[PDB]
Amino acid sequence: PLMVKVLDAVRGSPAINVAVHVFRKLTTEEEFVEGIYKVEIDTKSYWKALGISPFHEHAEVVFTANDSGPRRYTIAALLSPYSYSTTAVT
Amino acid sequence: PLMVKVLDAVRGSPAINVAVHVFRKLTTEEEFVEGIYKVEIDTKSYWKALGISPFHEHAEVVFTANDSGPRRYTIAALLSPYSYSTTAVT
Amino acid sequence: PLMVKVLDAVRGSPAINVAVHVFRKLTTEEEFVEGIYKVEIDTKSYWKALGISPFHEHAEVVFTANDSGPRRYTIAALLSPYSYSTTAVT
Amino acid sequence: PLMVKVLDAVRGSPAINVAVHVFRKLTTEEEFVEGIYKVEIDTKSYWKALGISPFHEHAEVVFTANDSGPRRYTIAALLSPYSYSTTAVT
Amino acid sequence: PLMVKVLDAVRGSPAINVAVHVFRKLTTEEEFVEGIYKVEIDTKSYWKALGISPFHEHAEVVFTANDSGPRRYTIAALLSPYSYSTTAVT
């Protein structure tokens, strides 16, 4: 027998993030649990999974990836629960 | 027998995020649970899964990806529950 | 036997997000649960799943992807339940 | 018999992140749990999984990846729950 | 019999990160738990898993990877829960 208890009794005011997983028993993926708490920020991808036999014969490819530019990302308390606090962004 | 308990009794005022998963028993994916709590921000993708035999013969491809420009992303308390707090963005 | 209990008794005023999943037993996907809590912001995609045999013979392709421009994204308490707080955006 | 207890009784106000996993029993992945708490920031990828036999014969490829530009990433309390504190970003 | 107890009784307000794992019993990966708490920052990758027989015959490849540019990454309390503190970024 399997018995799992998480946070059975709570009396205060907690900021909680719970993730309980109980199990009993070109690209291939059969059984999985991805990104239960996943935070992708400014994620880039170029030329993924082109396919079977791309550019097979006499290919003249000019690939240029220019990444630049004034960009700002301001974040406070990412994935960070808080109970009695003061969070400010200026 | 399987028995799972999460937050059986609560008496206060908690900011809670619960994710309980109980299991018993070119691109291929059979069984999965993706992005239960997924936060994609400024996610880019170019040329994904072109197909079977793209640009097979005598291909002249000029690929240019220019990423730039004044861009701002201001976020407070991302995936961050809070109970007794002061969250301000200015 | 399977028995799952989440937040059996609540007496206060909690800001709760619950996601309970109970299971018993070119692109192909058979069984899945995607995006239970998914927040895509400024998500881009170019040239996805062109098909079977695109640009097969004597293809002259000029691909230019210009990303720019003054853009702002202000968010407070993304996926962040709160109980007794002050959330302000200015 | 398997019996797991995490945070059985709580009386105060703690900022908690819980991840309980209980198990009993070109690219291939069968069973896995990835990114329970994964935070990708400014993650880049170029030319991933081109496919079977790309650029097979007489390929003339010019690959240039220019990464540059004024970019700023300001984050406070990443994956850092806090109970009685003052978090400020200026 | 297996019996695991973590933080059975809590009376104060601790900032806790818990990860309890209980087990009983070109690229191939069968069973794994990756990135329970993984924080990738400014992670780059070029030309990963090109495929079976790329550039097989008479390949003329010019690979140039220029990494540069004014970039700043300011982070406080990464993966660092705190209870009674003052975290400030200026």
From Swiss-Prot, chains A, B, C, D, E:
Q: What is the effect of changing A59S?
A: In AMYLD1; amyloid polyneuropathy
Tell me what effect the entry lists for V62A: In a patient with amyloidosis
| Modification after translation | Not glycosylated under normal conditions. Following unfolding, caused for example by variant AMYLD1 'Gly-38', the cryptic Asn-66 site is exposed and glycosylated by STT3B-containing OST complex, leading to its degradation by the ER-associated degradation (ERAD) pathway.
Tissues/organs with expression: Detected in serum and cerebrospinal fluid (at protein level). Highly expressed in choroid plexus epithelial cells. Detected in retina pigment epithelium and liver.
Effect noted on mutating E57Q: In AMYLD1; amyloid polyneuropathy and cardiomyopathy
* Record's GO cellular component terms: azurophil granule lumen; extracellular exosome; extracellular region; extracellular space; protein-containing complex
Q: Which GO terms describe its biological process?
A: negative regulation of glomerular filtration; phototransduction, visible light; purine nucleobase metabolic process; retinoid metabolic process
What does the UniProt function comment say about this protein?
A: Thyroid hormone-binding protein. Probably transports thyroxine from the bloodstream to the brain.
Full-length numbering of the shown residues: 31 to 143 of 147
Per the UniProt entry, the effect of S45Y is:
In AMYLD1; amyloid polyneuropathy
The observed outcome of changing I52S is: In AMYLD1; amyloid polyneuropathy; almost no RBP binding
What protein am I looking at?
Answer: Transthyretin
UniProt-annotated binding residues for L-thyroxine: K5, S85
By sequence similarity, the record places it as follows: Belongs to the transthyretin family.
The record's GO molecular-function terms, alphabetically, read: hormone activity; hormone binding; identical protein binding; molecular sequestering activity; protein-containing complex binding
The cellular location(s) given in this protein's UniProt record come to: Secreted; Cytoplasm
The condition associated with this protein in its record is:
Amyloidosis, hereditary systemic 1: A form of hereditary systemic amyloidosis, a disorder characterized by amyloid deposition in multiple tissues resulting in a wide clinical spectrum. AMYLD1 is an autosomal dominant form due to transthyretin amyloid deposition. Protein fibrils can form in different tissues leading to amyloid polyneuropathies, amyloidotic cardiomyopathy, carpal tunnel syndrome, systemic senile amyloidosis. The disease includes leptomeningeal amyloidosis that is characterized by primary involvement of the central nervous system.
> What more does the entry say?
Tetramer dissociation and partial unfolding leads to the formation of aggregates and amyloid fibrils. Small molecules that occupy at least one of the thyroid hormone binding sites stabilize the tetramer, and thereby stabilize the native state and protect against misfolding and the formation of amyloid fibrils.
The entry's free-text remark on domains says: Each monomer has two 4-stranded beta sheets and the shape of a prolate ellipsoid. Antiparallel beta-sheet interactions link monomers into dimers. A short loop from each monomer forms the main dimer-dimer interaction. These two pairs of loops separate the opposed, convex beta-sheets of the dimers to form an internal channel.
Q: Which organism is it from?
A: Homo sapiens
Indicate the impact reported for I41V: In AMYLD1; amyloid polyneuropathy
Keywords per UniProt: Amyloid, Amyloidosis, Cytoplasm, Disease variant, Gamma-carboxyglutamic acid, Glycoprotein, Hormone, Neuropathy, Phosphoprotein, Secreted, Signal, Sulfation, Thyroid hormone, Transport
Q: Subunit structure, per the record?
A: Homotetramer. Dimer of dimers. In the homotetramer, subunits assemble around a central channel that can accommodate two ligand molecules. Interacts with RBP4.
Provide the taxonomic classification: Eukaryota, Metazoa, Chordata, Craniata, Vertebrata
**Effect on the protein of changing I36L:** In AMYLD1; amyloid cardiomyopathy
Sugar-bearing residue positions: N66
